[PDB]
């Protein structure tokens, strides 16, 4: 699992 | 009467939300006076985010690489810099809708309103707490980074949170408005995990006082307890220790209801040890811990802005 | 990820809120174009409210008896009339902040955002459902009448609720913006009681789909059920009957998750018959019924305004 | 018990 940076 | 998870009115913040695009990466920014604040990972590409060197990535950009849109108006970027994990984009026009504001950093246990946004446009508003492990249990999708958390006092918006990222457990991590992360997290797509969380005891007590103010009294009892004997029960149930400062902060609610804080602690002990036996408190079958004592007084007394 | 009770951004409504005083009675009004809408019991005195004759009470007033304040600006009343249980106060200036808007009446089971206000000033925002018994479980204190409930679609505010009063059980009753009460209530301080309430089944199913979308899957099972066998269980547990139209409305969430609606009904049957055995769904130990299928899609897909 | 009209 990894973190998700939430720009788009 | 009634008790709801209640957010601050969001109009003052809505007027500050903009869209920031760099390349194919779009997110939200906060436009105050002539600066736009946004998460620095707007400068990343898909391949950049495992271990970006943000200093390198930023040196390779200039002002014209940042497209900022306030509604249907494009804002010209005339300066850019990095401050910890946020970018400051200086623009050539000051936001005429800038409210009176402060940048404050909050403590675990404190609450705030979140204005969730996509492409610079507000989507919805909800209330959050800073967890003891410095995560927040938000509702955020791809594109929500740059959405801010805030409190309002009188006419002044105190910004305390800017959203960056989602951990694998589905909880969220972000920075204060100076770009400094809450908790031991970094803006990279790596394996990171929150520390173990705990329940915010003073808040549970505040919510029990709200329940009494609203006529839910079934959990009350004639018992009292000592602060030391209570804290032994809190440790066993993964609750934060209660301090004398917490007892003091709860003073006003204690006086309003006539139930002493250590008397209410006796109720909480019994709820922890036996559950609710199929009953509910303020519509909940769980002990709620995202209302502060301030939130309770604010809502049960009708403070406005 | 994440799922929160999320309200619409309130700025468009904040710009419409005013204060209306008649005598010593103050409450909120809604200023759209050159009309201010407010609950007609602003014209009551303390002795008037057991059985007011509102027609009589209004004939005895003139325009100058209504003091309307928009912020620090007093608005001159140039006309007044009664429409069912609201007053229409015509003022001499149109609200420059009037949004695109509609007056809509909602059905039980539908949700909306409430902007709670005191003395014309917003205090907080939260999400509500119209209960099957036409009450709402709000958070309202003395002075909150005239606060409105609303939904936003694109740029258009659909007003659906204006707050009037609190029933003895602590729940709330009000009108649409044409002044017509939701449910069998009247704006008098008499003994009135809500009819028995029930749980909004289609909403519970929608929230179970939200839970699956967010990774809560423990309540799923391999069983299916028939719509008739399900509705026999719903009747026993005080749930509203599920219709084929409900099954159809849940279609999109069913397709997104791959769980057939009648398969999810089998889960709900088991939760009703056995409880959760100490587990939680989306942070709740109770079956939540104030999210519509639209609310779920909206929040899990990031619709903005 | 009675209803309470919530003007102020």
Numbering used by the authors:
A (entry chain B), D (entry chain B): 205 to 212
B (entry chain A), C (entry chain A): 1 to 305
The authors write:
The SARS-CoV-2 translates its genome into polyproteins that must be cleaved to release individual proteins essential for replication of the virus. Given that Mpro processes the majority of these sites, any intervention that stops this process, such as an inhibitor, would block viral growth. The crystal structures of inactive SARS-CoV-2 Mpro, with the catalytic Cys145 mutated to Ala, with 9 substrate and 6 product complexes were determined to sub-2.5 Å resolution.
We used 12-mer peptides, P6-P6’ (with the scissile bond between P1 and P1'), in our co-crystal structures. Six of the nine complexes were solved with the dimer in the asymmetric unit (in P21 or P212121), with both active sites in the homodimer occupied with the substrate, while the other three had a monomer in the asymmetric unit (in C21). We observed that the substrate peptide was extended along the Mpro active site with the scissile bond (P1 glutamine to P1’ residue) positioned between the catalytic dyad in all cocrystal structures. The N-terminal (or non-prime) side of the substrate had an antiparallel beta-strand conformation which was conserved in all structures, with the substrate residues and side chains well resolved. The binding mode of the C-terminal residues (prime side) was more varied, especially beyond P3’ position, and lacked full electron density. In addition to the fully conserved P1 glutamine, which is stabilized through multiple molecular interactions, the large hydrophobic residue at P2 was extended deep into the S2 binding pocket in all structures. The sidechain of the conserved P1 glutamine was also extensively coordinated in another hydrogen bonding network. The volume from P4 to P2’ is highly conserved between all of the substrate complexes, despite the variation in amino acid sequences; this high conservation reflects the specificity and likely evolutionarily-constrained regions of the enzyme.
